[PDB]
């Protein structure tokens, strides 16, 4: 108990081990059943603890390594009167273990914390209540993207239809993806060299209009 | 399952309740695949029913399910809806709102009955999109984004 699983979960995993021991017993050896059953029972309980007791599942060999690291740090503190540093643990772990590896192993074994963790003595604040949402764009972000698209269309309308369409097809403002010179050239019916030349002159006219009006600089941050 | 500023993870209790449920369900499916006797399958089904109970309304029947090394009950789906902190009262019949602030009050006896005194630094932020628009209307900034960048720092405000 205490190692991450409920008493009844441990009992059921031990019962699974007991089933295995039944199906693997050999009575000719004259050993009582408990001696052979305890091995598989312990095996099943330990495998269950390794496989289930972590919200972020960690492979069983890595759990073995992390437990070994914990026990090494505990013995080192029992002999040092203080908590060990990364370097002392790396010493006591043997070859292949430096301080950075100990740090990475400790970082990789950090269990998560509950979003419903209480904040304060009154029952009206959760730890999750202070975590801002970073995924969904802000109103400022959406408005700036909208004004950016509108200013880009305002700058592309100052080109001819063909060069504006060439840039829109070459950058993905039409169908998401970016086309190749051969695709845009076969779509407009010119040579890839010609489509590249008109893309160049479109970019040049856009640079000229931008140097004149400066209506797109602030969007570049 | 979010990563906090410190790079560590914080997660909701419903995940641990679902994990309880899924572990017990899978162990039951395996115990049935093999020829497990009556006592074991009965115990497994009882634990599965109580897992569903803890998921839907924890603490409703029996001892409430907690996390290891803590006496705090895990927050189930009934707890999410019910109470002063439930969904209805906390987020649906009343919400935290934008374009809002607060400060200490002070008598103004010179005000007329229909007036109050609002600090400049409050009203700037409270009316900030209006202020960006009006700053663009006048010559104070080229566009809205430049006006916002100008208001970002206090020393850049004229």
């Amino acid at each position: 108990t205490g190692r991450g699983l409920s008493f009844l979960d441990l009992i059921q995993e031990g019962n699974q081990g007991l089933i295995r021991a039944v199906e693997k017993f050999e009575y000719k050896r004259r050993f009582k059943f408990s001696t052979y059953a305890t091995w598989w029972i312990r095996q099943a309980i330990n495998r269950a603890i390794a496989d289930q007791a972590r919200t972020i599942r960690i492979p069983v060999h890595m759990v073995e390594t992390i437990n070994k690291l914990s026990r090494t740090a505990r013995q080192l503190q029992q002999e040092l009167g203080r908590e060990p540093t990364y370097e002392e643990i790396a010493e006591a772990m043997g070859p292949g273990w430096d301080a950075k590896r100990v740090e990475e192993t400790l970082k990789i074994a950090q269990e998560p914390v509950s979003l419903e963790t209480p904040i304060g003595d009154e029952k009206d604040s959760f730890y999750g209540d202070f975590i801002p949402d970073e995924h969904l764009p802000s109103p400022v972000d959406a408005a700036t993207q909208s004004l950016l698209s509108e200013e880009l269309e305002k700058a592309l309308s100052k080109l001819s239809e063909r060069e504006a369409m060439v840039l829109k097809l070459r950058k993905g403002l039409i169908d998401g993806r970016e086309h190749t010179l051969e695709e845009v050239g076969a779509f407009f019916g010119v040579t890839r060299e010609r489509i590249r030349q008109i893309e160049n002159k479109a970019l040049r006219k856009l640079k000229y209009h931008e140097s004149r009006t400066r209506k797109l600089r602030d969007f570049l941050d | 399952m979010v990563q906090v500023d410190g790079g560590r993870f914080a997660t909701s209790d419903l995940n641990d309740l679902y994990r309880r449920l899924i572990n017990r369900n899978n162990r039951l499916k395996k115990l049935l695949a093999q020829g497990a006797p009556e006592i074991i399958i009965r115990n497994e089904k009882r634990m599965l029913q109580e897992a569903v109970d803890a998921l839907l309304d924890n603490g409703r029947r029996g001892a409430p399910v907690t996390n290891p090394g803590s006496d705090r009950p895990l927050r189930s789906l009934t707890d999410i809806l019910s109470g002063k902190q439930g969904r209805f009262r906390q987020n649906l019949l009343g919400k935290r709102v934008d374009y809002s602030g607060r400060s200490v009050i002070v008598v103004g006896p010179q005000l007329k009955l229909h007036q109050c005194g609002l600090p400049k630094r409050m009203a700037l932020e409270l009316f900030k999109p209006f202020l960006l628009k009006k700053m663009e209307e006048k010559g104070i900034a080229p566009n809205v984004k430049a006006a916002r960048r100008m208001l970002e720092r206090q020393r850049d405000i004229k």
Binding site: - | I39, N43, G62
Partner: peptide, 14 residues
């Protein structure tokens, strides 16, 4: 009432 008690009772039958 107590599932551990119930299981330990069912186990005491065999």
């Amino acid at each position: 009432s107590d599932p551990v008690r119930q299981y330990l009772h069912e186990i005491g039958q065999v």
